[PDB]
Amino acid sequence: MKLSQDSSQIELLKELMDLQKDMVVMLLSMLEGNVVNGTIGKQMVDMLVESSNNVEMILKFFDMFLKLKDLTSSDTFKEYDPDGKGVISKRDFHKAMESHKHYTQSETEFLLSCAETDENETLDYEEFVKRFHEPAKDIGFNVA
Numbered sequence: 385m386k387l388s389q390d391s392s393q394i395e396l397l398k399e400l401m402d403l404q405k406d407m408v409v410m411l412l413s414m415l416e417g418n419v420v421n422g423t424i425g426k427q428m429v430d431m432l433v434e435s436s437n438n439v440e441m442i443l444k445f446f447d448m449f450l451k452l453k454d455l456t457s458s459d460t461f462k463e464y465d466p467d468g469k470g471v472i473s474k475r476d477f478h479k480a481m482e483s484h485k486h487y488t489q490s491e492t493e494f495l496l497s498c499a500e501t502d503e504n505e506t507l508d509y510e511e512f513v514k515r516f517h518e519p520a521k522d523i524g525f526n527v528a
Contacts, residue, residue, distance in 0.1 A: 385441065385445065387400070388445070388498045388516075389494075389497045389498050391500050394515065397519075398519060401519055401523045402523075404442075404523055405522070405523045405526055408523075408526035408527055409526060411428065412526065414428070415428070442527070443527075445520075446520055446523075446524040446527065448487065448491050448494070448495065449516045449517060449519075449520040450517065450520050450521070450524065451486055451487070452495070452512070452513055452516060452517050452520075453513060453517045455480070455481060455484050455486065455487070456509055456510075456512075456513050458484055460480055460483040460484055461480045461484070461509075464476040464477070464479060464480040464483070465509075470508055470509065470510050471504070471506035471507065471508055471509070472506060472507070472509055473505050473506055474496070474501070474505050474506075474507070475505075477496075477499070477507070477509070478492065478496065481495065498516075499512055500512075
């Protein structure tokens, strides 16, 4: 949550999510040979219950950075940016995520903060998506 807004720690965020992927891998390894209603599975669900808030916040991170893809690829976004140039205004981006409306206002402002601002007020949303979504696609798979 903290590193996403800043633009200098992209590599640190990537390393952190790599560590998260390895942790989920070890948990899946923990879950080998488990029978239905197994003791290890019960202990795992207990751990998730103890870490409920953190799991919730991670899931929100992943869900917004996964819906970013079809938000960008929707036709509403492509008509807020009719040209195929690939740069959209900040106001047009705000209006696009409200026409899509799959994002709340909190998600709206968080995505705006995490998006790099430009002097032309037109950010490369291709750069935005190919920086954020693909890591989300790669690591969130293990959580799912």
